[PDB]
Amino acid sequence: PVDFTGYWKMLVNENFEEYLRALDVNVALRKIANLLKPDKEIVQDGDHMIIRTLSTFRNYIMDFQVGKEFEEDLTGIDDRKCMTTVSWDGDKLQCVQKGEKEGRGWTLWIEGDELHLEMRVEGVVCKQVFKKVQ
Numbered sequence: 001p002v003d004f005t006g007y008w009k010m011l012v013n014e015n016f017e018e019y020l021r022a023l024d025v026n027v028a029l030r031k032i033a034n035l036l037k038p039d040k041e042i043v044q045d046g047d048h049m050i051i052r053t054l055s056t057f058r059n060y061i062m063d064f065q066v067g068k069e070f071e072e073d074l075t076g077i078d079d080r081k082c083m084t085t086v087s088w089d090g091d092k093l094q095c096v097q098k099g100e101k102e103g104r105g106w107t108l109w110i111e112g113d114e115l116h117l118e119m120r121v122e123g124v125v126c127k128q129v130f131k132k133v134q
């Protein structure tokens with residue numbers, strides 16, 4: 001597949017508020033959150049990946065093996081736990097987060113020199129796009 005490794009700076013963040021509200025994030029935390037511009041710092045070696053979502057407020061760190069279900073601790077976001085699997089779908093990464101909220105997960109892929117992220121929960125869609133600083 002491809003190598004997602006890089007420091008990717010946020011360019012686009014669409015519908016983040018609705019996504020966070022669907023996760024029952026409280027108004028105060030939602031308020032500070034949509035002023036953040038979280039970046040993605042990714043390091044990958046084959047199926048082993050660390051995805052760090054970095055913001056000035058709080059970070060969220062994912063560390064996993066593609067194909068292997070793990071207990072995902074979403075402290076800092078909605079403080080839930082999911083039974084999560086990230087899978088290859090050709091050159092895209094497809095993540096299913098099993099738990100309280102239905103249809104929760106995301107897709108990550110590269111189009112040209114842009115990193116694209118679609119986050120989903122309960123039919124709510126948030127679009128994020130990032131680029132490395134050339």
Ligand SMILES: CC1=C(/C=C/C(C)=C/C=C/C(C)=C\CO)C(C)(C)CCC1
Binds near residue numbers: 025036051058
């Ligand atoms: C609300 C909220 C945040 C949400 C982060 C999210 C929703 C990250 C999603 C990452 C995905 C979907 C894939 C790569 O791991 C962070 C923790 C930045 C700051 C505190 C407020």
Ligand code: NA
Binds near residue numbers: 036037038055
């Ligand atoms: Na930020």
